[PDB]
């Protein structure tokens, strides 16, 4: 369970940051280097325009055309010039990770520039969103942009959502999404003991083969979740990642708990 | 309302079963017309598998390995020389419309000859089940190949699902997957009354603007479903469909209820 023998069965770099939200006991490994969160920032835009809109109102449409869509888009890719509303949009990006969703919850915001307000309001420093979908996934070791570390990412997850400003409803509402989602079941869920619950969003950019999983996860008895960022990446850009790399760092960070 | 009326608006053509039942009260058009059924048949396969094996045991893996992955399979893409439970393969099937889970529940039944011997049981001799996907989706009118009446698949989808031999557990299991299904937001979903729920499952085959939505739909205040079998296409081949066609034709038939 060593994380660094998992980077040497693996051949990969391990990003970790998990804070039991109960205890406020953290694991760190590697908790303060950047990874390309890729998807796993759909999390941080969904909860932030839940913080502005209140759940009886998700219902509100908002006009899909030809120019918001970007590539995988499973749902959105039907909706031009349509409208969808924000609760729909929400569940597109959440569950099917749909990017042109996540774009429109953005604009929403007011922007990556309000995504960024609102992080530093947070005091997050390190997140660092520049891009949208889907360029925001075309990582570089060299660049910052839309990068964060786990530890700066686990602490805004945290703040936003686990011990955030979120209604009740609006909380389920995402949290459920999180936990519903089959997408990432190859990763915390995977490593998880069988009790436990994960909600999670996970995620993977272009290159190289940056795969994360962002979790609440529930041990069996804890009603607490236990913030857990996982980022993972190689040395190569075409490197491709193996999610029981993931599975097998949650499984030991969880016994940390 | 009249469905030749929505034909014309739309320059499509429309094949509807609809069955109520609760009163055993049909609505038909063109209902005796086959049409591609493209992903609409998931929720067949699923519901055949559900038959064979008791929710407890769904938790049963089958190993995934290049063979079987086949294009558009969001989920199973990741399962590449990973094992998956029957219960995370028909998820996927349902919310995500995967692909490879579909062939691999195929597979679990016994082959498209185990689909078809199944069908027949049911009285189904329309249903012809012939390719996996991605090949399924391959229509033509002048082909018979994957492709059933509105009436045939209705009864089909009631028999086997509503009015089946389901468990309790397989199937809330099955119909949750529908009722949650994000997918078909834009087909039946957004044609019916604002308190109606909709367990769907949508589909698109690659040609002729083949774009159906099966479900069951639930009339506020009313338990029993109303099976609903929507399937719609086009005179050319790379013609594109409108959902709202769908949208419209399910707010028309909803009335007949």
Redesign the interface.
Known sequence: KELNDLEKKYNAHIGVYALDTKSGKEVKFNSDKRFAYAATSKAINSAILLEQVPYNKLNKKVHINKDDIVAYS??LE??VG?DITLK?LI??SM??SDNTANNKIIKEIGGIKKVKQRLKELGDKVTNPVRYEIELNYYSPKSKKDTSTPAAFGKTLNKLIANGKLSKENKKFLLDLML?N??G??LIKDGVPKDYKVADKSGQAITYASRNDVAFVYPKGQSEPIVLVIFTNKDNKSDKPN??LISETAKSVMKEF
Chains 1, 2 share one sequence.
């Open positions: 499973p749902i039907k909706y349509k729909a569940e597109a569950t099917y519903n089959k997408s079941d190859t999610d029981k």
